[PDB]
Design an enzyme around this catalytic site. Structure first.
Site, PDB file in Angstrom:
ATOM      1  CG  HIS A  41      -1.920  -1.162   1.215  1.00  0.00           C
ATOM      2  ND1 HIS A  41      -2.755  -1.522   0.182  1.00  0.00           N
ATOM      3  CD2 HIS A  41      -2.118  -2.085   2.190  1.00  0.00           C
ATOM      4  CE1 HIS A  41      -3.416  -2.617   0.509  1.00  0.00           C
ATOM      5  NE2 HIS A  41      -3.055  -2.978   1.724  1.00  0.00           N
ATOM      6  CG  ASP A  84       0.697  -4.868   2.793  1.00  0.00           C
ATOM      7  OD1 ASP A  84       0.870  -4.130   1.803  1.00  0.00           O
ATOM      8  OD2 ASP A  84       0.463  -4.425   3.937  1.00  0.00           O
ATOM      9  N   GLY A 179       6.384  -1.359   5.713  1.00  0.00           N
ATOM     10  CA  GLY A 179       7.370  -1.662   4.691  1.00  0.00           C
ATOM     11  C   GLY A 179       8.742  -1.963   5.215  1.00  0.00           C
TER      12      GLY A 179
HETATM   13  N1  LIG Z   1       1.581  -1.186  10.580  1.00  0.00           N
HETATM   14  C1  LIG Z   1       1.092  -0.120  11.213  1.00  0.00           C
HETATM   15  O1  LIG Z   1       1.028  -0.027  12.416  1.00  0.00           O
HETATM   16  N2  LIG Z   1       0.571   0.884  10.358  1.00  0.00           N
HETATM   17  C2  LIG Z   1       0.771   0.953   8.977  1.00  0.00           C
HETATM   18  C3  LIG Z   1       0.101   2.092   8.508  1.00  0.00           C
HETATM   19  N3  LIG Z   1       0.112   2.510   7.170  1.00  0.00           N
HETATM   20  C4  LIG Z   1       1.056   3.328   6.653  1.00  0.00           C
HETATM   21  O2  LIG Z   1       1.966   3.815   7.365  1.00  0.00           O
HETATM   22  N4  LIG Z   1       0.908   3.666   5.362  1.00  0.00           N
HETATM   23  C5  LIG Z   1      -0.058   3.193   4.361  1.00  0.00           C
HETATM   24  C6  LIG Z   1       0.710   3.374   3.143  1.00  0.00           C
HETATM   25  F1  LIG Z   1       1.591   2.343   2.850  1.00  0.00           F
HETATM   26  C7  LIG Z   1       1.343   4.689   3.284  1.00  0.00           C
HETATM   27  C8  LIG Z   1       1.735   4.679   4.762  1.00  0.00           C
HETATM   28  C9  LIG Z   1       1.675   6.021   5.430  1.00  0.00           C
HETATM   29  O3  LIG Z   1       0.626   6.395   5.932  1.00  0.00           O
HETATM   30  N5  LIG Z   1       2.829   6.740   5.450  1.00  0.00           N
HETATM   31  C10 LIG Z   1       3.023   8.071   5.932  1.00  0.00           C
HETATM   32  C11 LIG Z   1       2.133   9.107   5.677  1.00  0.00           C
HETATM   33  C12 LIG Z   1       2.409  10.392   6.148  1.00  0.00           C
HETATM   34  C13 LIG Z   1       3.569  10.655   6.861  1.00  0.00           C
HETATM   35  C14 LIG Z   1       4.461   9.614   7.098  1.00  0.00           C
HETATM   36  O4  LIG Z   1       5.679   9.891   7.779  1.00  0.00           O
HETATM   37  C15 LIG Z   1       5.704   9.709   9.069  1.00  0.00           C
HETATM   38  F2  LIG Z   1       6.888  10.149   9.492  1.00  0.00           F
HETATM   39  F3  LIG Z   1       4.763  10.380   9.681  1.00  0.00           F
HETATM   40  F4  LIG Z   1       5.510   8.451   9.421  1.00  0.00           F
HETATM   41  C16 LIG Z   1       4.198   8.334   6.628  1.00  0.00           C
HETATM   42  C17 LIG Z   1      -0.565   2.701   9.588  1.00  0.00           C
HETATM   43  C18 LIG Z   1      -1.422   3.810   9.700  1.00  0.00           C
HETATM   44  C19 LIG Z   1      -1.962   4.114  10.944  1.00  0.00           C
HETATM   45  C20 LIG Z   1      -1.642   3.364  12.074  1.00  0.00           C
HETATM   46  C21 LIG Z   1      -0.819   2.256  11.993  1.00  0.00           C
HETATM   47  C22 LIG Z   1      -0.277   1.945  10.738  1.00  0.00           C
END
Ligand SMILES: NC(=O)n1cc(NC(=O)N2C[C@H](F)C[C@H]2C(=O)Nc2cccc(OC(F)(F)F)c2)c2ccccc21
Length: 225
Positions: A41, A84, A179
């Site tokens: 994702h 994933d 990831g």
């Molecule tokens: N496994 C685990 O616990 N989680 C994995 C998540 N999903 C995630 O992280 N994604 C989805 C995409 F692959 C893009 C990415 C993302 O949002 N990346 C993102 C977006 C904005 C800012 C950012 O930088 C930051 F530094 F904030 F992390 C990353 C997630 C969200 C909420 C809580 C738990 C989460």
């Protein structure tokens, strides 16, 4: 990473930051000279930062690579955390050294012992407010057996044999750690899922994709160059 500590600089030379328009989006893991493994994702202007500790400060090992091709797992679907995985082919082979090296990844499709202490690293959020760290964080997490992870009050049968769990009691992976690598005994075992989920709640363990379960897929894509 919730409840972690600043990692030692460059001590995890396989660690990648997968970026969209020069902003950190997901963790990744260098697994071959030209290939970074991440989660499906993450892709939903793509570059990969290798050799880094700080996302923003100059470091001699740091190098931001363009991506020639992005290969999400073809069975992955927006609404699920099955399958994933994402492979990113860098524009060129990475320049290797003490701060940039690929990580050996597990090919024996059998479970790790319950309680095995695994390391997860990332630039994900570090508290409930959503604070973003400038430098790499990590945490050591015990693997949580699948039967417990599947109990009604935990993840309620969502955990397939292709997924694994770790404990999430205050110490956890969170948003933006998606990831990245779950490393057990110096070997890549899991990849952080990229489905939204509650972070730091013991009743809702962290979910990681089992790379051994996807060995046929990874081998093929890595060979397709
Ligand atoms: N496994 C685990 O616990 N989680 C994995 C998540 N999903 C995630 O992280 N994604 C989805 C995409 F692959 C893009 C990415 C993302 O949002 N990346 C993102 C977006 C904005 C800012 C950012 O930088 C930051 F530094 F904030 F992390 C990353 C997630 C969200 C909420 C809580 C738990 C989460």
């Amino acid at each position: 990473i919730l409840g972690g500590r600043e990692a030692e600089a460059h001590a995890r030379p396989y660690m990648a930051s997968v970026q969209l328009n020069g902003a950190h989006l997901c963790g990744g893991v260098l697994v071959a000279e030209q290939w970074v493994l991440s989660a499906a994702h993450c892709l939903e202007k793509v570059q990969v930062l290798l050799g880094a500790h700080s996302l923003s400060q100059p470091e001699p090992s740091k190098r931001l690579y363009d991506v020639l091709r992005a290969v999400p797992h073809p069975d992955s679907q927006p609404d699920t955390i099955d399958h994933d995985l994402l492979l990113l082919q860098l524009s060129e082979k990475a320049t290797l050294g003490p701060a940039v090296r690929p990580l050996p990844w597990q090919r024996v499709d059998r479970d790790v012992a319950p309680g095995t202490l695994c390391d997860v690293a990332g630039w994900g959020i570090v508290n409930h407010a959503g604070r973003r760290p400038d430098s790499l964080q990590h945490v050591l997490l015990p693997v949580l057996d699948r039967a417990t992870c599947n109990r009604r009050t935990h993840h309620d049968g969502a955990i397939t044999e292709r997924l694994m769990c770790a404990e999430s009691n205050r110490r956890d992976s969170c948003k933006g750690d998606s990831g990245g690598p779950l490393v057990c005994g110096g070997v890549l075992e899991g990849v952080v899922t990229s489905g939204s989920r509650v972070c730091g709640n013991r009743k809702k363990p962290g979910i990681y994709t089992r790379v051994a379960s996807y060995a046929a897929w990874i081998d093929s894509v890595l060979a397709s160059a």
